[PDB]
Amino acid sequence: HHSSGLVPRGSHMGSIIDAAAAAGPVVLMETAFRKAVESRQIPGAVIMARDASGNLNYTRCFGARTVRRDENNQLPPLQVDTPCRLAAATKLLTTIMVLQCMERGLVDLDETVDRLLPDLSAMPVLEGFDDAGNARLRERRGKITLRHLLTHTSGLSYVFLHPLLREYMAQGYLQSAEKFGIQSRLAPPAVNDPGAEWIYGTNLDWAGKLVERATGLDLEQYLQENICAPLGITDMTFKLQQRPDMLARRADQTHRNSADGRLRYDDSVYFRADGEECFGGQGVFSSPGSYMKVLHSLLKRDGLLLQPQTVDLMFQPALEPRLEEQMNQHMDASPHINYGGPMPMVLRRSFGLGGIIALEDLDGENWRRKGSLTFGGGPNIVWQIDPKAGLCTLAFFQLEPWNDPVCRDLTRTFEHAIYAQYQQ
Ligand SMILES: C[C@H]1C=C2C=C[C@H](C)[C@H](CC[C@@H](O)C[C@@H](O)CC(=O)O)[C@H]2[C@@H](O)C1
């Protein structure tokens, strides 16, 4: 029988295997993250999941915030409070700032942009190039509204994505615009008329300008007063170079080389120069912890950033049938871009305000539900908010390029496990 004064534990091999039950989905998933760091497939990752009740408050950090060894020859850890490059995960923040302007009566979503953005309204549409080889520009048909900007239906694209714009740069129309190695996000012409199609573009850079002009504040100040302050965030900024405490702790960017699949240090412009102006499309540096505070507040509908009914607006399908059909066609045919990250390659989607909306359950009752909102950022950052499931999640890496198979697979494994164990 048992030893006097001591707790009755397992006393031989058979009864020690029994005393602890088998490994659940979350434990197994954590092992997969640890192995991916151990085998040098990723530098590191932070994964986080929350529900509204507080019963789910899960944060795990794996690996390093860089591939460069520090002053003690160690690889410093990626932490929940490590300042990271958000890239397009900034777009959700800028969307929130716009909606706050709407709430305070500074703007109307269906108002034309001409009043606050006459510089955008004046820009032509690039229709193509004649056989002579010169640019064929024309006047826009219809007006861009704020809701066009928030839903990426304005006609704006990104130079690095659209062939017409790539040829536009090639012909030498966009050389004088850039500063400190970062491209002038505002110079290129539009490639369609507003309302014509869903096109991923510089819409939130323009929406950020609109906020600055409507409020009389620069985006950094507006961010601090209206997103950071009410959530107690002190770690979220457009102006990393002016925050020496964040600078000393920041993640380095890592890039996976096409050839040998090896990880290398990525010495890119965004970490050694702020520029002068805040870009609402891609400019924010923040910790995963601070970002989760935003997601969680939206999930809770706690009124700290926006009124519950304004938040509900973000999750409503914004596109009419023709646009919804065209967006789905484009996304299904573009797995090389993969806007939806871990989501199935073929899925019925729409766009809300702030991200892609799933119009059907991803896998019945096993994973994300209809009505869930999602987007991401370049360095394999993925966020989602799932009101019907009562969960929000984020997977933060600092690894380019976007849509890295190892990161996507780990992200899927993380979400699947959390849903399997904790979705209510
Ligand atoms: C929401 C997702 C949509 C995207 C659409 C097209 C691209 C692949 C995005 C990532 C581009 C990024 O990894 C590289 C670019 O920033 C390079 C450049 O701007 O010169 C991606 C990310 O923004 C995340």
GROMACS .gro file of C-alpha atoms in nm, residues 91 95 109-111 113 120 125 138 140-158 190-204 206-207 316-328 330-331 339 349-356 375:
model
   70
   91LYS     CA    1  -0.516   4.793  -4.184
   95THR     CA    2  -1.022   5.084  -4.029
  109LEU     CA    3  -1.911   5.628  -4.508
  110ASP     CA    4  -2.102   5.690  -4.832
  111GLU     CA    5  -1.972   6.047  -4.877
  113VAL     CA    6  -1.368   6.150  -5.077
  120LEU     CA    7  -0.698   6.137  -5.461
  125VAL     CA    8  -0.726   5.581  -6.410
  138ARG     CA    9  -0.829   5.878  -6.837
  140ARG     CA   10  -1.241   5.821  -6.338
  141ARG     CA   11  -1.609   5.729  -6.384
  142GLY     CA   12  -1.807   5.769  -6.060
  143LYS     CA   13  -1.674   5.896  -5.726
  144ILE     CA   14  -1.465   5.714  -5.466
  145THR     CA   15  -1.640   5.702  -5.129
  146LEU     CA   16  -1.493   5.620  -4.790
  147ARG     CA   17  -1.669   5.280  -4.802
  148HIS     CA   18  -1.488   5.204  -5.129
  149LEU     CA   19  -1.156   5.262  -4.947
  150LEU     CA   20  -1.252   5.040  -4.651
  151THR     CA   21  -1.364   4.753  -4.876
  152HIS     CA   22  -1.079   4.777  -5.135
  153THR     CA   23  -1.326   4.856  -5.417
  154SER     CA   24  -1.193   5.205  -5.506
  155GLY     CA   25  -0.993   5.102  -5.815
  156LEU     CA   26  -0.660   5.142  -5.635
  157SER     CA   27  -0.405   4.861  -5.644
  158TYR     CA   28  -0.044   4.808  -5.532
  190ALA     CA   29  -0.585   5.381  -6.011
  191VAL     CA   30  -0.640   5.078  -6.241
  192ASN     CA   31  -1.021   5.077  -6.240
  193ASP     CA   32  -1.325   5.286  -6.148
  194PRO     CA   33  -1.475   5.272  -5.797
  195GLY     CA   34  -1.723   4.989  -5.751
  196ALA     CA   35  -1.594   4.797  -6.057
  197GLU     CA   36  -1.394   4.528  -5.872
  198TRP     CA   37  -1.235   4.418  -5.546
  199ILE     CA   38  -0.864   4.500  -5.575
  200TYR     CA   39  -0.614   4.482  -5.290
  201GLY     CA   40  -0.460   4.829  -5.274
  202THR     CA   41  -0.331   5.138  -5.097
  203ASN     CA   42  -0.685   5.219  -4.976
  204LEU     CA   43  -0.591   5.237  -4.608
  206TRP     CA   44  -0.553   5.713  -4.820
  207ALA     CA   45  -0.801   5.639  -4.540
  316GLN     CA   46  -2.145   4.242  -4.243
  317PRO     CA   47  -2.082   4.141  -4.606
  318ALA     CA   48  -2.018   4.476  -4.781
  319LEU     CA   49  -2.014   4.361  -5.145
  320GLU     CA   50  -2.308   4.333  -5.386
  321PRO     CA   51  -2.343   4.001  -5.575
  322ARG     CA   52  -2.133   4.099  -5.881
  323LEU     CA   53  -1.837   4.211  -5.666
  324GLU     CA   54  -1.865   3.917  -5.423
  325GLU     CA   55  -1.858   3.678  -5.719
  326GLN     CA   56  -1.560   3.854  -5.881
  327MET     CA   57  -1.364   3.860  -5.549
  328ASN     CA   58  -1.422   3.488  -5.490
  330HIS     CA   59  -1.003   3.607  -5.810
  331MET     CA   60  -0.911   3.460  -5.469
  339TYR     CA   61  -0.521   3.658  -4.906
  349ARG     CA   62  -1.617   3.473  -4.894
  350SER     CA   63  -1.703   3.839  -4.883
  351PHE     CA   64  -1.532   4.152  -4.756
  352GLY     CA   65  -1.654   4.353  -4.455
  353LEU     CA   66  -1.489   4.661  -4.305
  354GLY     CA   67  -1.144   4.552  -4.187
  355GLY     CA   68  -1.115   4.208  -4.349
  356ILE     CA   69  -1.239   3.902  -4.532
  375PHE     CA   70  -0.682   3.931  -4.247
   0.00000   0.00000   0.00000
